[PDB]
């Protein structure tokens, strides 16, 4: 009110006095029971065949309703879940036809139970996603995968997917990947023990030099966490009682939504400009500084985002495609919504309540009618749709003003996994190709020029990723090799906002040359030997169906109209990543999709 | 120090104790005298053939130096000065081969003397640019064009281009153009007299309803203007004495650069969210809210930006192309800088001080050597250049962190100038095409659906532009008809940042359909009759040579590193729009170009 209702939307708390944990509700519907009870059968139109439209479409189809899912894309479902894999007719995206890589979603955390449990329910195998590079000679991933476990704020209630897996063990993290800033290059393990050398590269002085950018961030967020939490002597934090925990989060909204992350680190935490430059570079907050503090704080209110990540065997595309198998009659491809007409008594009486006119991608027009509608397309895409009658004023402003972040990924295929090589592996692998080739690159050295002469050391890393200040910014290595293959696809460039704005000023074929050179600036020129020449890129700002990476609020935007983002417009409901407060996560879309399916199922 | 030196950069004040007016210096060099005296002849490399590289190239060539201007574009000079006109071989961009429109710069203010005087010196005719629609039956534009006049802060010194023109008179403004927000549509003259109806459309209440968004902005900026200025009883403002005027501006930097424009209007001016929504919609500040207050405040510290604008006969391209005629031997086309190597004693001693390696657009490589260098390419473009040795740390961060705004223009050609039509003109012009066609569109009406049924009224406007909340946002009409023609090219869509981010998620041929429909939402469906089918668009975020519209700082960025943006890096100097504080203006580039030519001409 308004802050308390925002905190309820954030923490998934039902209305008073019950204060129901909506996460438990969503798990009961999505996994355990379904839509109980099945409401009056309705004709339901669903716009968009991403994970939100598919989750809601599956749930409502199995509940008895007559569902039609209109999808603008002509060949592919899943939306922002896109995997570069070899389709049957098409040529393969890479040289090795078995190689694949992600254009969108790639890692799924353990604290997102809906998405993980949905993956298991559909019978998909999931492996560990190595967010930090690991020791491949540790842990036990041959054991059955541990079940999905969620702990609720409500009393001591929990939710579990299956029997525990005591022999499954995560491999030990190495932190042997690189951090190359200001023409100097160390390893994450060395930066943790002595951050002084790198921090001085950002012209830091005094106490901030002997602190890692990670610790600096967490120390600054401690007084904010004190609103809803209590720091223990363990270093662990426990949440305050529900009354003071809900009011504590509501005070974070009141006192910090008007802050950007940059203004927070500069004025509230009193960090130097040099400290922010170092933090934003190594921790990926440069191009998020001018965006809302709350957006950045939400992913990282955890003080151990050292948790478990997962990825699907065969690609993230397995999740939406498996759902699409149970929706063959419902999914209509190649139909883009251009006109949304609905009837709000608060297309007329006695007739259909919702009329959607589509245009073939890319009959002249088709009109789809129904009783209720679920629009799961991004607001950057809804912006070009004509509507009658007008939505509520505050939602219209939400569709107009919602900032949509930019994101571009550049993928380079390699015939060998050179990032796992030791220096001895380099000597053998290069000479095997041609005698004397190893010594040849030793004498050649490294280019002094860098977009930010001794041969770079061997990376020798399994999974994880390296950070740099050249346009590539972040470079992820595959967590698991494709069996029967010898190569792998490196995520050579991955950035957001202004950093991504650099890449999406060029075309796709113009991206591979720069990304390889900037990859050599960190790992060495000699990696060019194993480059197959095949590359893939995905600019989400320039995708006609996504029109951006994800909804990312600027300061105060959430307080202004987010409570109006979720509110239905008569017979028109809204789901998707932008409707939740878990922006740019699959879980946020699955949350609002299940939430929308519940509301439309029991509608009068 | 640091604020005072920023205020000196802003106001073009030379160093103490002389406190020279640099604008007078730049006028003396660019127009009157030149580089006096001609310094030691040098080999100078200039990167980029936009207005900054051309102004500096012309000045240094005529001063005796050996200049080579490397331009990445293979066919066109001028950079962000781009005009859609019919070239000799090419097919014409529109149906009428005589029609032209601007892809970039289009209006030149009277308070930008360098650009206006440069246009006159090159012998180019300039007409009035009607920023607000005018009465074509008023004023006298047949008289000779008035000379360029500039008033300096220094004492009572002025600068004039030529003899005055007392008979030249600007046409009276009509404000008959449209403002269509929240499904309601009035005219700018009616909104000025009674803003109550439109403001209530943004859900405003109380005193703010009876105030135009324009007046609300100026009232909020009055205490800021009180820093450097004094409000008179005339309503006019005079500047304080130089001591308190320079320190006043330096206090604006100190107290407001950490503000965004949204945070300023919300926290300092205490406007409601509804007030900001109304202001940002009608006055074009929605997608600039999260950007620096200082960036937005700089264009509008004037309380009468009701001043005189100008445009060049034949297109804005006349200005760079005319300069390019005097640089035929110096300009090298189709060569993109990929590696910048220089020698800074503070490519070695005894040899060339600057070595630039280029790649043909789009010999494998070419190396260009010289004694000094002037890089006029945007920082979004320099970001992908490899450099040795590294620039100063703060400049490197400036190249990395500088936000570059997005901008897209959509141009639609029409066989007639329907925006000048009266209702009687509509009746005759439609029936002339086909009998009964006028009545046909009267019965057809207007689509109720809108991306935000009685036939829209006749616009009947000459010049100026209309404002709306649909994706087109701003629509400008040609100020002057092309003689011998009957049609004209409407700027159907023109937006920045998030508003422009919507359009540059589609391709060029995908833009014309939406822009015409949204144009009909304001002017009427019946305008489709005169649409020739030919369109032109320009997405500057997706231009490989611009990589964005212009440098636009986020909060605090200017205080952080702008003094390091201008600072030379040994033998490498920097010019361009981003180097000045007049971002997204031609004048800012001409300022830094002349400023760079002066420094490199007298270099030891
Ligand atoms: C680069 C990137 C990386 C990501 N990584 C992760 C990650 O590691 N983990 C994670 O959990 N999440 C990640 N995400 C987020 C996740 O991919 C999405 O949030 C998720 O797909 C939810 O999307 P959605 O269902 O809300 O909408 P979308 O997936 O975008 O679905 C929208 C659908 O609507 C269709 N559509 C659009 N316009 C129209 C129209 N006019 N008419 C009809 N149909 C239309 C589109 O074709 C599309 O299929 C990432 C996102 C990006 C961009
Ligand atoms: C949509 C829009 C509207 C505008 N309207 C106005 C207006 O009404 N009034 C006004 O005064 N200003 C306006 N401007 C601004 C004005 O057009 C520019 O500020 C002006 O052109 C100054 O540009 P510049 O010389 O600094 O650089 P640019 O004009 O951008 O020149 C850069 C040049 O460098 C070249 N180049 C780029 N990368 C490389 C490389 N790697 N190697 C070699 N060469 C390279 C490019 O090809 C280009 O020719 C507008 C700008 C835009 C985008
Ligand atoms: N602009 C953003 N913060 N986007 C989201 C980044 C995190 C993303 N969901 C991931 O798994 O990597
Ligand atoms: N993002 C911006 N404010 N860009 C500049 C807008 C003004 C522009 N120079 C013009 O003449 O119209």
XYZ file of C-alpha atoms and ligand atoms in Angstrom, chain A residues 47-53 70-73 78-81 103-108 335-337 376-378 381 385 407 409 494 540 545 549 576-578 584-587 589, ligand 1:
96
model
C -0.748 -14.913 -27.640
C 2.841 -16.127 -27.818
C 4.309 -19.639 -27.691
C 7.172 -18.956 -25.306
C 7.490 -20.718 -21.978
C 4.689 -18.556 -20.549
C 2.191 -19.266 -23.324
C -1.191 -17.778 -31.600
C 2.552 -17.680 -32.309
C 4.161 -15.100 -34.586
C 7.260 -17.192 -35.324
C 9.985 -21.189 -27.115
C 10.595 -17.501 -27.814
C 13.629 -16.382 -25.813
C 14.497 -20.060 -25.249
C 21.115 -18.215 -28.052
C 19.061 -17.335 -24.966
C 18.479 -19.092 -21.652
C 21.338 -21.319 -20.496
C 21.492 -21.663 -16.673
C 18.710 -22.607 -14.253
C 0.304 -15.605 -36.985
C 1.293 -12.237 -35.498
C -1.249 -10.283 -33.447
C 2.387 -13.403 -23.025
C 4.264 -11.312 -25.619
C 6.771 -8.695 -24.385
C 6.112 -6.238 -28.889
C -0.610 -3.623 -31.329
C 21.715 -8.359 -25.254
C 25.684 -13.382 -27.857
C 27.984 -11.940 -24.032
C 17.873 -9.925 -29.026
C 9.623 -11.412 -31.826
C 16.506 -9.172 -23.981
C 5.446 -13.460 -19.115
C 8.826 -12.625 -17.662
C 7.992 -8.901 -17.604
C 15.128 -12.099 -17.321
C 14.528 -15.510 -15.751
C 12.438 -18.397 -17.052
C 11.029 -18.825 -13.538
C 7.468 -16.323 -16.805
C 20.272 -13.617 -23.812
C 19.300 -14.163 -22.801
C 19.742 -15.079 -21.852
C 18.868 -15.604 -20.902
N 19.358 -16.513 -19.977
C 18.528 -16.994 -19.094
C 19.036 -17.952 -18.132
O 20.194 -18.360 -18.062
N 18.085 -18.403 -17.240
C 16.752 -18.028 -17.210
O 16.015 -18.521 -16.350
N 16.283 -17.128 -18.123
C 17.133 -16.648 -19.013
N 16.666 -15.745 -19.936
C 15.252 -15.357 -19.885
C 14.325 -16.382 -20.526
O 14.884 -16.863 -21.749
C 12.973 -15.728 -20.809
O 12.654 -14.857 -19.730
C 11.834 -16.730 -20.990
O 11.844 -17.226 -22.330
C 10.484 -16.138 -20.651
O 9.934 -15.513 -21.829
P 8.387 -15.260 -21.977
O 7.609 -16.579 -22.024
O 7.939 -14.318 -20.927
O 8.273 -14.577 -23.400
P 9.030 -15.031 -24.717
O 9.892 -16.256 -24.397
O 9.779 -13.888 -25.290
O 7.848 -15.455 -25.654
C 7.163 -14.491 -26.479
C 6.585 -15.215 -27.667
O 5.552 -14.407 -28.271
C 5.720 -14.382 -29.669
N 5.243 -13.092 -30.156
C 5.891 -11.890 -30.053
N 5.237 -10.882 -30.575
C 4.073 -11.462 -31.057
C 2.955 -10.928 -31.726
N 2.821 -9.636 -32.038
N 1.964 -11.781 -32.068
C 2.092 -13.073 -31.759
N 3.096 -13.690 -31.132
C 4.063 -12.824 -30.807
C 7.209 -14.613 -29.918
O 7.403 -15.229 -31.186
C 7.588 -15.556 -28.770
O 7.508 -16.927 -29.144
C 17.528 -15.197 -20.907
C 17.080 -14.282 -21.853
C 17.954 -13.760 -22.801
C 17.440 -12.774 -23.815
